[PDB]
Amino acid sequence: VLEKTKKRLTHFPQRKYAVKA
Amino acid sequence: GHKTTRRVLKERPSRRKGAQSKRTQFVRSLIREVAGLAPYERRVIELLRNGKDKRARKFSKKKLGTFGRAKRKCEELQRIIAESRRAH
């Protein structure tokens, strides 16, 4: 990957979450 | 029709995608002097130096295709004539 992509993925990764009913 | 409260929008950075920049104007002016003129631009400039503005505009319109492009080219070459006389 590029360094810009690596920085973005390092500091803003996909998060774990859940919407409660 | 329907009534809604209009907002004031954030200024678009895509607005004026031409050039209000002074550096591009500087580069355009420098290249013009270095490169020289096209043959049709030289004919328009030799008509404008003789005062035959009507013929110059017709020649520019014929060789450019639009009255607006002809007007812009004639103003540019008249400006070149003005700075050439000022340097003279």
Partner: protein, 167 residues
Amino acid sequence: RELQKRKRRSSRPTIRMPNRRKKALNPAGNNIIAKSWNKKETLSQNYTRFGLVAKLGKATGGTAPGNKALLSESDAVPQQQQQENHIRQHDLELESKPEVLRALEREATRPVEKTVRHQSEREREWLQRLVDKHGDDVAAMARDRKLNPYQQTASDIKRRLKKAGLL
């Protein structure tokens, strides 16, 4: 067709493909959802039993009963009833029920460690040499060209001193 006729009369074996799918149809692991996922139940029934929302969009068909998964003003300001220029960037500050829901809240609310970032040996030596000549005058340390080659501002050096515990 000629190829298939050839293999029918050939003694070469028929290579049977296993039914290997690219994507698994059931969650797996040692997390909370994996131990409570029923493989014989659909997505909507499983998320109903968890107490979670499966689809955040508009309902697209009828659902089974008990679905529960397919979800003064001085200045005229529409946003002043909405309240509770910089915000926290890397997280949110969010302030009977099914057991999976409570387990998810419990594991999301449990305290975690921070792994506080330390300082290098050379940075500590630089901050130490900076203290040994001026003491507390952070303005003089910023002015110093010899001991502070990168001309850092006194606020940055004060913050670094506070992190080092050198005040």
